[PDB]
Structure formats: C-alpha cells, structure tokens
C-alpha cells in the first residue's frame, strides 16, 4: 500500500471527515487528559508580579473516526503539517500575558495516532503568567503561583478537561532558580468557571516557592548591625567635652536613613508594613536614641558649669559630675543588652510564624 | 440530517448570503447591545499616562437571514473558524494604543446563533488605554479613566451602539490592585461623535480609582517629621559656644533638599504645584529657619563679647546674656507649637477637599 | 436591483477595471487633496528627538471609471474589505520611524464613492516622527516639528499632492500636552523633492510648541537661590575665629556641583552651552567666591596675630583688625546687590530674545 | 533541455514526490550531519543569564529520490523559493528564547543538490540562548555555555543527528568580545533525551569563556586600597588631642560601605558569597578597626587626665602617656604588615584555584 | 494597444518567463551595480556597539528577456505589486541586526524597465549595524563604521556585485548628528568572502566619524580643575593650628573619587586604560598629595611642641618653625607650576597623536 493514498483517504476529500465538527456530536462530552512538562522556569520578578515559564503541553483525546485498522503496526508518527485538517480542542490560559509559539526551522509540533483513535498533541509554548504574590513577610516568605487551563468556547456538556492520574506534572532534571527553591509538592485541583454565557471547565496547577535568605542577609542585615556598633563607639570612650560625638551621631543617622530608603527600591509599593521595614525602623530608633543620650549628658554638664560660675558652687559640682558619669556608664552597659533581647525575640517569632505558615 | 450539509447551506455557495452587505440593507439601523467583562486590571502608571486592561468584549445583534428553523433545538454552538464568512460589525477604541489579539493553541473566539437570528460574538483583547490623570492633589486623589467604543466606518443611520440594560459591566471576583481601590459605581453614559465626514456613534464607560495612602506616608511623611525633630535637637541643649550646631544645621538642610528632590522622581513633570511639594517646602522652611535662629543668637553673643573687651562693660553683659537666653528659651517653646498648628490645618483642609471632590 | 450584482459589475471580472493602472493613463497628472485630523499628540521626548502622533489621514481623488449613475442616491458607503481591488495612491512619510496600522476587531478603514467618481479614503495610523529640536535656550524655547508626506514611486508628471483649501488640519477638542502648549497657527507650505532618479512631490505641515516654565522653575531655580542665601549666612554673623565657616563653605560648594551635574541628566549631549548652564555656572561662581572671602580675612587675621606675637605690636593691631572688619561689612552689603543686578539682566535679556524669536 | 521542464519534473505534479513522507520510509533512520558557523557573538549578560549569537546552520542528508542523472554537471544551485516543496528535517534548540529568522530583500536561504541525492541546507538564525553561569568566584572565573540541537517530533529510530568529523565548528576571523576571551577548545559531545512520549536525539556544543581582569581591577581594587591608605593617615601623625581624627574615620567608613553597596549592582542576587564580597568585607573590617584604635587611645588619655586632676598624680602620668604612645607606634607599624600578608594570601589562593579549575 | 494585455504578455502565462531562473543561465555572471542613498543617520551608541541608519538601496542589472520594443517610449514606470513575478537578486548585510521593511499605506518599492532590459529596483530599509569601535582615546577619537553587502546564495561565477562609478554614495542635505561630525570621504573598497561551501561576492562602504569635544569638556574637565583649585585653598591661608584643613581635604578627596566613578558610567567595560582615566587619576593624585602635605607639616609642628615642653627648648623652636613655614611657602609656589606643565604636556601629546591618526 502506498503511504500517500492512505494518508489522504484517512483525512481528505474522499473521507467525510469535516474538521469543524467535534467527535461524538450530539453525544457525551469529549474527555481530555492533559499532561504538562516544565522545560524552564525563570524571571520571577516582583514589580511586574509575573514569571516566565516554558512548558511542553500534551493533551490526549479519543475520536471514533480516524480508526484505520489497515497497517499492521499500532501507531503512526505523522507529519506536523496536517495539524490544521483535524479537530484540535481549544485551550487558553486565564492568567496569561503574551504566550507566543516557537517556529525555528520548523514549527515545534507533534502528532501521533493509534489504531483505536487515541491521538497525541504536543505543543511548545513560553507563557508569561501573573502571580499575585503577598509580601507580608518580605525577607522570609512562601509564594504560591497559579497556572490555569480553561476552555474558551465550549460549555460543561462538552470537552471536559481532566488531569492525568500518573505523572501529571514533570520537571526537567537539574533545573534551578537563582532566588527561589522549588518545592516538590505540586498539588493539583480543579475549579470550574461560571459566567452569564455559560459554565466552562477549568483545571489548576499550584507551585510553592521558598525564598533564599542568602542575599538579603549580607546586603541589609550585616551592614545595619555594624552601623549600630559604630554608633555605640561614642559612648564608651569620647569624653563629655567632645565636638566630634555630635558629628558622628549626625552622620550615622544620615547613613541609616539613606540606607533604609535604598533597601525598599526593587519592591513594589504596598500599603502594609513589611518585616524589613520593622527591622530598619527599630535600628533607626536605636541610633537616633544615642544622639539623644549625648544631648542629655551635655545639658547636665551645662547646668554643672553654670552653677560652678556662680564652696557653695563646689557643693553641687560633685553630685552633677557623678550624675553625668552615672548616665554614661549606664548607657554603656544597657544599650547592647536591649538590642540583644530585641534581636532574639524578632528572629524567634519569624522562625515560628514561617513554620506555621508552610504547613 | 448531516451537520456539514446544513452548515454549508446556511452560509455557503447555495446561500445568497453575501458577507459584504449589512443586514436590513436600505433599512432601519442595526441595533447592537455591548456587554463587557473585565478579566484583569493592571499597570496603572503615571509617566505614560495609561493603564493595561484585559476585557471580554461581547456584542449581540439581529439578522433576518441565518434563521434556520430546521433543527429541533434553540441555539447552536458553532466553530470559531467561520467567523470570516459573516457580517461582523466594526468597532474600535478611541483612546487606544496597541490592543493585540490572543492566539494560544486556537484563536480565542466564540460564536452562537439562535433560531430567530440573534448572534453572540465574544472576543478577548488586551487594551492599553490612555487616561489623562490630573495630579492636583498628589498623595490623596481620585482618578477617572475613560473607555470609549465607537464605529469607524458607519454613520448614525446605521449600526447604532446601545448599552446593556442589566449587568452591563462585570468584574472578576477577587480582583485587586496594589496601588488603587476600585470603586463599584461604574456610571455609563454615551456621547456621539461629530466629524466633517459624518456623525458617528460612540459609548463610554467610566471607572473611579482611589489611591492608597499607605506607601506614601511611610516613604515621605514619616522621615521628614523625624528630620524636623532632629533639627530641633540643637536648640534645647547645645550651649551658645558650639561649632557643631552649625554643622548639624547644614547637614539637616542638605538631607532635606536631597530628599525633596528625590520624592518628585516617578511623577511626570507638570506646571502646577502638588500637595507634596507644599508640605516639603514648609518643612524645608522650618529647618532653614532654625539655622537662622543660631545665626541670630551668635551675633548677639558677638556684640556682648565685643563690648566686654572694651564696670561699664559689665553694665551691658547681663542684659545681652539675658537677651540671648530669652531668644533660646522662646525658640524652644515656640517651634513645636507652630508646626502642630500647621499640621492640623493642612490635614483638615485636605480631608475636607477630598470629601467634597468625591461627591 | 440586487446589491451584489452591481457591486461585482462595478469592480469585478466583467468590468475591465485593472487595479494596476492609474486613472487617466497617458494623461494629465492625478490631483489628490489631503486632509489630516490629529486624534492625539504625546511623548515629546528629547534624547530620542522624536514624538508620537495618532492621525486620521484622508485623501480624495477623481476617477473617470467607477461612475455608476444607476442607483438613485448620490453616494455609497462601501465595505472596507475591497480596498485592495482599486487604485490606492502611494504615500509615505519621510521623517518616519515605525508607523504601524490598527486592526482591532476590524481593520480601521473607510470607503466612499460618489456618482461622478470622487472617492474618499480614510486611514488611522500612529506615527513616530523625528523632530530635530534645537536647545539653544533650554528652559524657554519654541520648537518646530515637521510632518512630510511624499510620493515614493511616481514623478511630478503624475499624482500631484495638493493641500485642502478649507480646514486642512483639525485638532481634537480638549487635547492637551503635559509639557508643551500647542500654538494654533499651523502654517502649511510644500517643498518638492529632487533626486537623481527623478522629481517627486511632497507637502509639509508645521507645528509650533511653547514649553511651560512651571516645572523647571521649582525644580532648579528655587533651590539654587536658597543655597546662595545659605552660603551668605556665614558672612553676616560667624566671628573670624570660626572652624565651622569653612565646613559650611565646602558643603555648599559640594551640593552646588552635585546639583549642577544632576540638572543636565535628561537632556541629550550637545556641544553648545545652554542657558541653564550659564545660570548654574554663575551661581557656582558666587558660592565659591564666598569661601575665598573667608580665606582672605583669615590670612589678614593671621598677619595681625603674627605681628602681635613679635607698643610697636599694638601699633598695627588696630589697623589690621579694622581692615578685617572692613572686608567683612563690605562683603555683607555688596554680595546681594550684585546678585540682584545679574538676575534682572538675565531675566530681561531672555524675555526679550524670546519675544523676538517667536515672531 | 529546458530548465523549467526538468525543474518541475523533479519535484512537481508528474513526480510522485510527496513532501510529507520521510525518505527511506519504513527503513533505517535518516542520518544527518550538522555543521555550524558562528558569525557573531555578543551581549553576554548576567542578570538575564543569557547571550546572543548569530549562526549559519548547515545540515546535510541523503535522499534516494531527487537523483536526476540527466544534466552533465555534478551539482545544481537551486532557488531558495522551493524550499517548501521538499522534506526539511525538524530541528529546534532546547535552551532557546526567541530565535527569529532574517528576511532582508530576500529570505536568507541556500539550496544545493548533487547527482546522488545529497542535499545542502543553510539557514541564518540569531539565537538568544540561556547560560546558567555560576558566580562562585566573581572577578576571576571560567563560564561554560551550552548549545543544544534536538529533534522535536521524531524518535531514535528516525532522523539520527550526527556531528561533522572535520571542521564541525568554525568561527569568523577577527571576532572579539569586549569582556571575555574565547577559548579555542570547543569540545563536542552528544546526550540523548528521554521522555515519557519517547526517546529523542540531541547533540551538544560547549564554549569556554575567560573573563578579563582589566576593568574590575581599576574600578574596584584600586580605589579601596587608596581609601585604606587614607584611613592609615590619621595614626602616623595627628596628635591625641584631635577632633578631626574621628570625622576622618567616620567619613572613610561611610564611603567604604557606600562603595561596597555600589559594587554589587549589576550582578544578579545569589545566596552564596562571592570573592569580591570577601575582599570588601576585609577592607571594611580594617577601616572600622582603625576608628576603634582611636577610641582606645582616647579612653586611656581620659584616664590619665582624670587621675591627673585628682606627686601622686604625677606617678601615673608618665606610665599612662607612655602606654598611649606605645599603642600609637605599634598600630603604626603593625597595620600595613597584616594587610600585606592578607593580600598575598588572597591572591595566591585565587591564582591556584583558577589553575586547578581551568583543567 | 491595451496596457493590461501587454503587461501580462510580458511576464505572464503566455510568456515562458520563469521567475526561478537567473538571466543568462549557463552563461557569464550577472553584473549588478549598487547605489546607496542615506536618508538618516542616528543613535550612535557605545554599550550596544551599533548604530541606526535608514537607506534607499538601488540596484540595477540587465536581462535579455523583458525587452519589449513595442511601445514608442523608452522606459515604463510599473506598479510595485508585481515585484514577486521577476528575478530579484539576493542581498543581505553581514553585520546586521534586525533590518525590517516599511509598509505605510503601501509597501515602499519602485520598479522601472527600459527598452533594452535594464531594470531599476529601489527599496527603503532601516538597518541596525554593528560597529566595533575602539576606545583607546575616549574624549578625542575617530571611529570607522563598516557597511557590508554580500550574496548569500550564489558563488563568484554568478551575480558579481560592483559599485557605481559616479555618485556611489549620497547623503541627504542638511543631515546632522548631535555627537559626531560626519567626514565627507567615504572610501569604497570590496573584499570577497571565502567559505568551505564556496566563494561569495561582497562590497564594503566605510564612514569616518569625529567626536565633538563640547560636551565632555564642560561635563568633566571644567569641574575637576575647579576642585583642584579648591584643594589648593587650604595651603595659602589656613594656619598650622587648623582642624578644618583636614576636613576640607577629606571632602575634596571623597568628591574626587565619586566624580571619577560617575564619569565612567555610559562607557562599556574595557580592559585597556582610556585617556579620561589618566587625567582623573592624575587629578586624584594631586588632591591626595595635598592632604599629605598637611600631614607632614602637622607632624613637624608636633615635634616642635614636644621639644618645647621638655633656653635649650628655645634653641630648636626657631629652626622647627622656620622649617614648617618653609614647607608651606614651597608647597604654595610649587603645586600650580607642576599642574601647568602636566596639562600642557597632556594636551600637546593628544593633539599630535590625533593629527597622526586621522591621516
Ligand atoms: C537612670 C538613667 C537611665 C537612662 C539611661 C538610658 C537611656 C536609654 O536611651 C536607654 C536606657 C537607659 O535603657 C533602656 C531604658 C532599656 C532603653 C531601651 C530603649 C531605648 C531606646 C534605649 C534605652
Ligand atoms: C521676641 C523673640 C522671638 C523670635 C524667636 C522666634 C523665631 C522664629 O524663627 C519663630 C518664632 C519665634 O516663632 C514664630 C514667630 C511663631 C515663627 C513662626 C514661623 C517661623 C519660620 C518660625 C518661628
Ligand atoms: C575693598 C575690598 C572689597 C573686596 C570685597 C569684595 C569681594 C567680592 O568677592 C566681591 C565684592 C567685594 O564685590 C564685587 C567687587 C562687586 C564682586 C562682584 C563679583 C564677585 C564674585 C564678588 C564680589
Ligand atoms: C599590645 C598592643 C597591641 C594592640 C594594637 C593593635 C591593634 C590592632 O587593631 C591590630 C594590631 C595591633 O595588630 C594585629 C593584632 C595583628 C591586628 C590584626 C587584625 C586587626 C583588625 C588589626 C590589628
Ligand atoms: C624641600 C621641601 C619640598 C617638599 C614640598 C613639596 C611637596 C609636594 O607634594 C610636591 C612638591 C614639593 O613639588 C614637587 C616635588 C614638584 C611635587 C610634584 C608631584 C607632587 C605630587 C607634588 C609636588
Ligand atoms: C467521559 O467520562 C465520563 C465519566 O467517566 C463519562 O460519563 C463520559 O461518557 C465520558 N465521555 C465520553 C466517553 O465521551
Ligand atoms: C433600533 O431601535 C430603534 C429604537 O427602538 C428602532 O427605531 C429601530 O427600528 C431599531 N432598529 C432595527 C429594528 O433594525
Ligand atoms: C490638476 O490640476 C491642474 C491645475 O489646475 C490641471 O492642470 C490638471 O489638468 C489637473 N489634473 C487632472 C484634471 O487630472
Ligand atoms: C546511518 O548510520 C548507521 C551507522 O553507520 C547505519 O546503521 C544506518 O543504516 C544509517 N542510515 C541510513 C543509511 O539511512
Ligand atoms: C560582467 O563584466 C565582466 C567584466 O567586464 C564581463 O567579463 C562579464 O561578461 C560581464 N557579465 C555579463 C555581461 O553578463
């Protein structure tokens, strides 16, 4: 038998196969199993609130026509150039921007057909998909991103989309993300769509992402702790009669505010307050407080000198000097201890909220 | 009856149905009801003066042809591949940039036809639409964005566009915007278009947006208030013989001007003066004023020392020192009180103008 | 009469109408009147040296064929789907980048035909057009932007382009630009094109733009004047024995140079010197001069002390101190007066050059 | 013989050549040799993690049909306009984004055919290819970038891809990269692909890149070393009673932290710590340490003065002053020596790790 | 004679003209003269290493067919819609990225045909072309940019490309570049291409660009010279007992390093050292040297005071003070003179290297 003659008899002019009619017309809905392979994951960005993904869609359905039973083999690998003369199902993504095809040297496509009529359609597509991430806890967080596949033009009574029982979602070996660690959970559930026009089938796939705390810690946490230590430098040593202490204080407050403004740059604007904001605010409160500590001790010294200029003057000199020294030594010991207790409280509470949230 | 034979008899070669002629030719204008669904709203940006929206256009009209009365059911769900062999109406958007289609695995389209001839056309389109926002009050404002649908090629005597009486505009459940809160008002009115060529139908849809005052307050209002307090630090304590006071003043003025320049960065250039500009200008006036307060007290002290070098000298020492101290204490108490009264006046006036404007 | 039969008899197979031949072949040139409507104007940018415009091109010409005289009405509104079976004229823009079409739900097009044969062609097109703006006077300037329409493939002997006698250029009501004010002058003149291949027709349209001095004044003029006043603060008060005066001077010079560098950021690089550069340079000269004033008075005081250490020493003390005070008071009064006279001279000369230029 | 008659007899309607059937159908797999030429290499960027390349793909295979043996010459240079009427093989790139074609004046294509049936297909394509670079050692590193060619639609039993024995990869003469030096090694190996659908052929090409240490050294290494020397300036000279030393220290720490933040700007965020981070951290530790050295000597001097105010006081004056001077001189000599030993250790260890890694 | 009948007889179905066969088949190579017109030149950018150009390609060749000799005129201006039914030659650009066509209202094309058979093909194309500029001398340099036209699919034995003897390259009148001055030299030479597949014709056009030294001088040279003068301010006046001198020095070094980092921003990273780097490095060396001058004089004064505290002490006071003053006055006179001699040497050497290079 020649291949050309059979190939046109199956889906051509002698065949009454019209490509505009669904199989099992006036009949039970056409069931479709969908298997997705993820070639690459990338560009998870915040301002845009979307990511880039390259998938290998694969959908199988049955047709009562296209049952040959004439060649002795089970399946046939056809050309991808007659994929316009058969009944492809409609499928689109709901949270989709763009999503072009690929045509390098040939259009990337695959066609297979078995003896009973079960077909196999494979398409390569790069999708930009919108993920509405919640930045309640910015440095430490888990983000869930949604992929939705749904039928634009058919109702529930036709083209019901079902998932695949085994190996529904696969991932390429040795696939990594610079910022996030992918979680091998991939829970699958389906939610139908209701509209005024009708009821439309849909299926959903969920991915869990855990952010890496490697970059943020060095970029932000480590410098701020140093600047606090540097602010602490003044108290321990520099004598009361010091012009420089004030300059040191002003510079360390300026650098604190400019660094705090710099940190919240990439992040999109949000009404709620992030964890990094809380940490930076507390740090700014500490440095500012130090410059107030000097302000206090200098005013007490001024009172001491004013009374000294006016023995009776000697009577208050010792007590005022002792009070100033008392303020200094107490500041010295107290400021690190409270920073320490705040730090342990902050870390433990975030370490416990994340543990509860991940479950 | 076979489906193919009926399908070609309705709109094919045996049918005298020419797709270039409007229904009811030489007759009353073809009425068209338009229903819009909003799948996503996003990217409301200022410099570009435009936003991004993904809609589901739906338009229904009647045809005297395409009345079958042969199948026993009421409606038929046709393929979206013969949407080029019928009379689609022309429709374009006036404030439109771009507005591509979507073709993922199939072109997103929907066709329905009833027994009488009422058709249903559904198209998915992402529109970049230009909104001429007015930034009279930058932190607190309400923005109205306009969507216009109008007929390019037909006059009033044909293809009159009407809105839908019930459920004219729907929004997807759980749809949120990071910066703005959408208002569920959506007032609909239509304005016709007059040109030298002719008179053309149009319909308009209006959306109201309220900006969130969560990001701006932390980013700008909170640091400026701190810097003012820091400027105030000098007066209360540092003695008259102080080199540092001047350095503190210069730094706090530098940081004020650089922060003020930084704030007006994203915003597009406009001739009129925004509210944020007024607040920053007043704050800069306050900090600058402080450095003048020192300038005054130092000059008075200089006069005191000059006369002291020239008892007769003692006669003016007490009065000049008392005057310098008087200036200091008065500055101390007066500066916070006036800031407070300015702040309450500013907040109350903006809170009342917004209340009047929203109505 | 049926509409289809007439519609194909006019421009179809029974008609000898070949769409590849110009009307009046071997005859006088085909005259074409061109009317342009401006729907939107936007994105006037400097670095790119181009702007964005959305027009409604309209061109009318006469044909001896397509004269029906069979329907009782004067004109017919045809479909925009047979605009490929007639003789559209060629037209392109010379200073053009991009210039795509618009195809939303239908291609935006319009066809009309009268009894004598006068046709009406309307096309919507967004053009990016290059404007070679001259920044001789950057804050205050008038920019002229050119639109050119010319024939690529025909010589003078054919397809002569003429403007429209009445209402040649119209603008949409309530159309505004954020940065510029459009001038309602729109002078129209045409310049022919000469090439080695031949002589080609062209027509030109000119638009006048006046920049708004609302943003620049607050952004640049107002802060610099403040910083000059702040520089002046040192002279009036701070005594000769001052460490801080020098620090104040250095900071105000640093902030001046960084602000001057910041101002010339958006503007494209040009060889010639802009007005804003002149103003900033003079301001920098003033602040720098002040720090020199201190340098002078401090050196004179040093000479006074050196002689004092070496009565005979008392003999020169009074004269040197008086000279230092003389320098101080004279600096105090002279510096504002010269700034004032420079400012009035600068403003008056620019206000008069603009008045001469606009004419 | 006329050329047209032969040209249509070979691949036209009289020929039974169907372009949908692979040569040697129901037979051994079609072997394909692939030769690649690299016209340009460019845009190696880090954030995107991809590069741009312009290749000249060339693939040869044999066909039993298309064996003419009628013209007296060996080969024929055909038009590139009938490349749609023959059996092109499918080929796509796995780590591919974009990859458009080129159609300037004509589509860039080449067709050749020999007497036996060996064809030659040449295509020009610009590929954006993703390279997962590892930044373990940022200034000094070797990056390997992968190009993969694989068959989308055929299994192992068909269309086996083989490399070319001689001159498999060529490069254009005088081709240079601004940042990297290309290595003339280009090791070629092939890895097959396994999927649930089937087993698919693939071939891989590897390129080695060595970064230039010319820009980084001047941009980052040279300024930091200067700033350390500048920090060292205080110790050698400025006396114990110095207000300025503290200001110098604070400024040199501020500039160090801002420069360190600035350096890690272009680089994409990564969890692991880069070499440049280690160097900057050590440098910041050194400058910060100096400001502590002053803090220590000032506190010792304070103790000396406090006891002096309270002979018995003279008894401890000499020892405390000697201790302060001892601390100063020792700091003077010790700080450069340790910097030197750290620097030599760092350079030698990186120079040896790179030598081991390149092998 | 009717125009349609002749038009189809020349290149239609009755004509044996196959558009897939080159003229003079089995014959001498088809000679082609190429004339290029440059409508616009723009966007010469450094990071991308490419520029944008809009040309009017024009190529003429002879055909033995298409020789009518039936109309009484010499040439005919045909429609640009049958440019697909003739033998256009292949032509592509080797250093090409992108290069789209233009289709505004009509595709921009031109066809002419003479009595003998000489045709004229004109195409408008915007080309992004890669220029490998060498930044050995960054502020003053001459850049040569290459345009290459070559045949993709034919060998030397066919389609030989020749230049035009007269007026090979023309430029539009009044065409200017903001940054560069175009040189009216445009030397033309051709270099053939050798490949393993075969030998392919090519022709090359060279353009010379001279950079304007108007922007760079004001942006970089002028501020640095001012900052050096400002650094010099300290030496002449401020007495030895000065806290401020050190602060002035540190600020002027900080501003120098930040300005130096800022200057090398737009420029792409390169291993070799640019002229601007040399100038900035020398300037930084001068300012840094000044702060060392103070360090020296302060240490000498410290030795003087230390011996004074320990007449015998008076014996060394005069000599140490005289030495300190000697260092001051000598610094005063020497520093400007050496700057002057360096400046004249630098300018003269660059002015002479450019003169040699341009030849
Ligand atoms: C009796 C004299 C004690 C005054 C010295 C004093 C001053 C001071 O600012 C602080 C002190 C103690 O310790 C405590 C009270 C824990 C504060 C925690 C929070 C803040 C911002 C700073 C701490
Ligand atoms: C009798 C000595 C009083 C002079 C001290 C004085 C100085 C001064 O700058 C201010 C004072 C009072 O209070 C008032 C007058 C409310 C001002 C409001 C606006 C500004 C910028 C600052 C305030
Ligand atoms: C007799 C002592 C007078 C020297 C004080 C003196 C210093 C000085 O720098 C200036 C003075 C006067 O007024 C004039 C001369 C108008 C200058 C105009 C331009 C510049 C930059 C500053 C002004
Ligand atoms: C007996 C008095 C000696 C104290 C002076 C002293 C202070 C000091 O900070 C350093 C000294 C010595 O040398 C060594 C110990 C090598 C340190 C290496 C690492 C660091 C950050 C700095 C060095
Ligand atoms: C005898 C005392 C002389 C020392 C004063 C001295 C210090 C000094 O730093 C320089 C002096 C002279 O002149 C020369 C030697 C020309 C140097 C040229 C290059 C540099 C960076 C600065 C210059
Ligand atoms: C799809 O599956 C459902 C549930 O098993 C079944 O009721 C229906 O008939 C199936 N559709 C077919 C066989 O077309
Ligand atoms: C559209 O509605 C108007 C108002 O009801 C009516 O006058 C007109 O005839 C309608 N057009 C039709 C029925 O084609
Ligand atoms: C166009 O107008 C000119 C000037 O009125 C006239 O000479 C010419 O004949 C006209 N072209 C026609 C009528 O085709
Ligand atoms: C391809 O090469 C293999 C190994 O030499 C051979 O077994 C196979 O038959 C070849 N395929 C052909 C000749 O079609
Ligand atoms: C092209 O020119 C060369 C040199 O004059 C000549 O030898 C060749 O025959 C020409 N090609 C033709 C006439 O086809």
């Amino acid at each position: 038998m020649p291949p050309s003659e059979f190939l046109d008899k199956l889906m051509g002019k002698v065949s009454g196969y019209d490509a505009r009619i669904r199989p099992n017309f006036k009949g039970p809905p056409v069931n479709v199993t969908c298997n997705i392979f993820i070639n690459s994951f990338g560009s998870i960005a915040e301002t845009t609130m979307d990511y880039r993904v390259n998938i290998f869609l694969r959908q199988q359905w049955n047709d009562p026509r296209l049952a040959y039973s004439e060649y002795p083999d089970d399946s046939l690998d056809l050309d991808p150039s007659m994929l316009d003369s058969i009944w492809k199902p409609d499928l689109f993504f709901a949270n989709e921007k763009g999503a072009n095809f690929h045509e390098v040297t040939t259009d990337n496509k695959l066609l297979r057909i078995s003896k009973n009529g079960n077909v196999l359609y494979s398409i390569r597509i790069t999708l930009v998909l919108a993920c509405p991430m919640d930045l309640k806890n910015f440095p430490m967080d888990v983000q869930t991103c949604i992929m939705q596949l749904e039928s634009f033009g058919y109702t529930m009574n036709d083209l019901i989309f079902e998932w695949d029982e085994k190996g529904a979602v696969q991932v390429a070996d040795g696939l990594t993300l610079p910022q996030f660690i992918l979680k091998e959970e991939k829970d699958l559930r389906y939610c139908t769509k209701h509209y005024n026009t009708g009821k439309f089938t849909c299926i959903e796939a969920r991915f869990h992402l855990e952010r890496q705390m490697g970059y943020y810690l060095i970029q932000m946490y480590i410098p701020s702790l140093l600047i606090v230590i540097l602010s602490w430098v003044s108290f321990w040593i520099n004598m009361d009669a010091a012009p420089a202490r004030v300059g040191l204080g002003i510079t360390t407050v300026l650098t604190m505010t400019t660094q705090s403004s710099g940190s919240r740059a990439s992040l999109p604007k949000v009404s709620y307050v992030k964890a990094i904001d809380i940490w930076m605010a507390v740090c700014l409160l500490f440095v500012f407080s130090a410059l107030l500590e000097y302000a206090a001790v200098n005013f007490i010294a001024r009172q001491h000198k004013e009374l000294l200029r006016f023995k009776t003057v000697e009577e208050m000199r010792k007590l005022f000097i002792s009070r100033a020294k008392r303020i200094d030594t107490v500041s010295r010991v107290a400021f690190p201890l409270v920073f320490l207790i705040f730090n342990i409280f902050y870390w433990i509470t975030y370490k416990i909220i994340r543990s509860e949230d991940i479950h």
Side-chain angles (χ1 to χ4, degrees), chain A residues 108-139:
Chain A
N108 299 356
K109 270 166 182 56
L110 198 163
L111 192 41
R112 207 166 298 182
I113 276 174
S114 46
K115 191 161 287 292
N116 54 10
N118 300 20
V119 304
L120 180 52
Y121 191 51
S122 178
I123 295 289
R124 184 190 180 192
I125 286 175
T126 56
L127 292 77
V128 174
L129 297 174
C131 188
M133 64 184 73
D134 170 84
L135 304 180
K136 184 57 61 181
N137 301 337
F138 175 54

Side-chain angles (χ1 to χ4, degrees), chain A residues 11-137:
Chain A
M11 72 207 71
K13 293 179 179 179
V14 309
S15 56
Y17 180 77
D18 196 347
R20 300 176 301 176
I21 311 299
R22 51 180 279 260
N24 289 337
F25 189 79
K26 295 302 181 179
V30 176
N31 296 332
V32 171
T33 74
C34 312
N35 182 11
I36 187 174
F37 178 94
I38 302 192
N39 207 19
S40 154
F41 209 115
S43 193
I44 315 169
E46 283 81 17
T47 62
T48 70
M49 300 279 256
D50 61 22
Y51 57 99
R52 289 197 85 267
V53 58
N54 192 31
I55 72 174
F56 274 42
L57 198 66
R58 318 189 177 97
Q59 40 191 350
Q60 322 176 8
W61 71 96
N62 194 298
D63 199 302
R65 307 161 303 196
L66 285 72
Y68 44 102
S69 71
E70 190 271 337
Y71 282 166
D73 50 354
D74 58 12
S75 72
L76 292 173
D77 289 5
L78 279 298
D79 211 33
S81 44
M82 76 300 286
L83 277 173
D84 56 359
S85 64
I86 55 172
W87 189 75
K88 295 177 300 300
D90 46 346
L91 194 150
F92 83 105
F93 300 86
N95 52 341
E96 179 268 326
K97 313 173 184 181
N100 46 3
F101 281 106
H102 280 259
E103 72 283 8
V104 176
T105 75
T106 55
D107 58 20
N108 299 356
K109 270 166 182 56
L110 198 163
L111 192 41
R112 207 166 298 182
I113 276 174
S114 46
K115 191 161 287 292
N116 54 10
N118 300 20
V119 304
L120 180 52
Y121 191 51
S122 178
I123 295 289
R124 184 190 180 192
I125 286 175
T126 56
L127 292 77
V128 174
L129 297 174
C131 188
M133 64 184 73
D134 170 84
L135 304 180
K136 184 57 61 181
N137 301 337

Side-chain angles (χ1 to χ4, degrees), chain A residues 146-147 163 186-191 202-206:
Chain A
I146 308 287
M147 182 176 303
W163 270 118
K186 298 163 188 175
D187 52 341
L188 310 173
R189 53 177 170 265
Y190 54 77
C191 64
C202 170
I203 52 183
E204 178 183 355
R206 290 178 167 267

Side-chain angles (χ1 to χ4, degrees), chain A residues 144-167:
Chain A
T144 302
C145 293
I146 308 287
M147 182 176 303
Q148 303 176 240
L149 288 72
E150 86 182 359
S151 167
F152 192 84
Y154 284 75
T155 44
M156 209 46 49
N157 57 7
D158 294 307
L159 188 134
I160 301 182
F161 282 109
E162 285 285 2
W163 270 118
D164 205 359
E165 291 83 3
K166 64 188 177 295

Side-chain angles (χ1 to χ4, degrees), chain A residues 235 285-286 289-290 292-293 326-327 330-331 334-335 338:
Chain A
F235 289 9
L285 176 64
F286 263 68
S289 178
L292 260 295
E293 195 88 356
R326 183 79 301 179
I327 292 301
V330 172
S331 88
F335 296 102
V338 175

